[PDB]
Amino acid sequence: HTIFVQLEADGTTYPVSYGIRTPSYDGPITDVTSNDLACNGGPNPTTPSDKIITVNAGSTVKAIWRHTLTSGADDVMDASHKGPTLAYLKKVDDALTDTGIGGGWFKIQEDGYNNGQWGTSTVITNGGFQYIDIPACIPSGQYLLRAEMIALHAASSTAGAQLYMECAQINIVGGTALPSTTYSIPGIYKATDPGLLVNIYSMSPTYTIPGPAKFTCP
Ligand SMILES: *[C@H]1O[C@H](CO)[C@@H](O)[C@H](O)[C@@H]1O
Ligand SMILES: *[C@H]1O[C@H](CO)[C@@H](O)[C@H](O)[C@@H]1O
Ligand SMILES: [Cu+2]
Ligand SMILES: [Li+]
């Protein structure tokens, strides 16, 4: 149970919920066919924002995670909630109106299982920071940035995987082109994916991270 509550970009750490469509409730999405998968919603209604955060292309941003909106650095997520972390971008005409539901998404970050250490565990232990590299080669303009943590502690059953995501409203600044291939959310995940329907208690130090291949600048 966790929420992407604030974003650091270009040397500024913005306030809780600034530019981020945060739910007040920290519960999971478990149906990967739901439109709620894009930017949360449904059982976790989100709070609208009229703010857009400036982000330099080619820079690293930091998605900061907390158990609840007012939690501190020792209360990111239950350490049992082992799984991957991921991040996606979608180019949008207007970050104040686009719901993120549908096509246009591309993966820009993923952290799976590395010699016994899960991506979520690293975010928990490093103070709730998920590090995300914004591609250098993409066009300026408005985007949604979707950051995600997936807990797999109950994932050996269908729809047992727990997905926690929020969308930040950003304006990317600074030879440019979008990726050739983009994807739909919902669409990228299926309940039978080998990284979602999985028994993590039988792994020794390959985990197949769900979703499309990460975009790399050409
Ligand atoms: C995810 O899928 C790959 C096959 O591409 C496997 O290496 C892995 O065990 C998991 O099933
Ligand atoms: C660009 O290249 C890197 C590997 O060097 C991948 O992480 C990415 O998926 C894309 O192929
Ligand atoms: Cu939880
Ligand atoms: Li490409």
Side-chain angles (χ1 to χ4, degrees), residues 72-96:
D74 68 353
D75 189 24
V76 174
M77 188 166 57
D78 182 337
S80 73
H81 283 35
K82 289 169 170 178
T85 69
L86 313 89
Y88 301 79
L89 284 172
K90 181 195 174 178
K91 180 75 190 68
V92 301
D93 292 357
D94 181 5
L96 310 169

Side-chain angles (χ1 to χ4, degrees), residues 154-171:
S156 62
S157 304
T158 302
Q162 294 174 3
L163 300 83
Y164 303 90
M165 77 299 298
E166 279 78 24
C167 290
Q169 301 171 172
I170 71 173
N171 192 45

Side-chain angles (χ1 to χ4, degrees), residues 1-3 5 26 65-69 71-72 75-78:
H1 285 56
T2 196
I3 306 172
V5 298
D26 60 8
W65 295 83
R66 289 294 186 260
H67 173 62
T68 67
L69 292 172
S71 290
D75 189 24
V76 174
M77 188 166 57
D78 182 337

Side-chain angles (χ1 to χ4, degrees), residues 18-216:
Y18 184 106
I20 302 167
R21 300 170 187 180
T22 54
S24 54
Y25 181 51
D26 60 8
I29 300 303
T30 60
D31 184 344
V32 302
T33 73
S34 180
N35 291 346
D36 300 335
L37 185 64
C39 289
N40 217 329
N44 323 304
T46 60
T47 299
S49 178
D50 71 354
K51 302 308 194 302
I52 301 177
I53 293 167
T54 303
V55 173
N56 293 312
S59 71
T60 295
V61 303
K62 309 172 195 178
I64 298 165
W65 295 83
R66 289 294 186 260
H67 173 62
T68 67
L69 292 172
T70 56
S71 290
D74 68 353
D75 189 24
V76 174
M77 188 166 57
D78 182 337
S80 73
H81 283 35
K82 289 169 170 178
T85 69
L86 313 89
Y88 301 79
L89 284 172
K90 181 195 174 178
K91 180 75 190 68
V92 301
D93 292 357
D94 181 5
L96 310 169
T97 61
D98 199 295
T99 60
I101 298 162
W105 293 101
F106 53 106
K107 182 184 283 176
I108 63 162
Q109 182 271 336
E110 59 181 4
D111 191 7
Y113 180 68
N114 283 122
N115 199 42
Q117 177 75 5
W118 287 95
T120 60
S121 296
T122 293
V123 174
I124 291 160
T125 59
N126 76 6
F129 297 93
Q130 177 189 10
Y131 295 95
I132 298 161
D133 294 349
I134 304 299
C137 59
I138 58 176
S140 299
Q142 292 177 51
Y143 292 74
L144 299 175
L145 169 69
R146 177 186 182 276
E148 181 170 45
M149 300 227 281
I150 303 180
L152 299 173
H153 58 289
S156 62
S157 304
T158 302
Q162 294 174 3
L163 300 83
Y164 303 90
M165 77 299 298
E166 279 78 24
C167 290
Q169 301 171 172
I170 71 173
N171 192 45
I172 290 176
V173 301
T176 67
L178 287 165
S180 297
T181 312
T182 55
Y183 304 87
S184 305
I185 308 181
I188 54 173
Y189 306 151
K190 299 182 166 87
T192 53
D193 286 344
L196 289 177
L197 184 63
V198 61
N199 175 8
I200 64 168
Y201 305 100
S202 84
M203 287 161 175
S204 70
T206 176
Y207 171 77
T208 303
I209 298 163
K214 185 170 50 172
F215 175 65
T216 302

